[PDB]
Design a protein around this ligand. Sequence first.
Ligand code: THP
Ligand code: CA
Length: 129
Amino acid sequence: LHKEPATLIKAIDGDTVKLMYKGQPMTFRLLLVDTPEFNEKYGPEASAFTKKMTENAKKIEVEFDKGQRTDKYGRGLAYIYADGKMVNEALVRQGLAKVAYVYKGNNTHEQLLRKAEAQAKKEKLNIWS
Ligand SMILES: Cc1cn([C@H]2C[C@H](OP(=O)(O)O)[C@@H](COP(=O)(O)O)O2)c(=O)[nH]c1=O
Ligand SMILES: [Ca+2]
């Protein structure tokens, strides 16, 4: 897997962000996670968490997995990095996301994220409290 440049256009919610990728605006959905919706418990905290992460990054990187790169809504599917920290992993680690939507061929960081979830669960963080 390769890291590719992109710039923040706009924070959206816990697991979607609007980025400019190869010069085009695109909504990206974070692979392998599910944040609660804004209208649900920990929804605002997940949105805030991702927002802060992407807005404070001097460098945003997009990492496609081996499989599908856009979903049926035309959202990009990627691992998103903020100054080298993976947002996907960070949300899970803090119990603001569950590991989810694990489809074969788009699951490289699956284990990493389950490990993060296991530790978030252990600590009864946020969604696990
Ligand atoms: C994360 C992810 C979501 N999706 C689709 C599946 C879900 O379909 P449905 O909308 O039909 O439920 C939806 C979940 O995204 P949201 O959690 O952003 O709603 O987006 C994928 O197709 N591939 C993926 O890797
Ligand atoms: Ca969601």
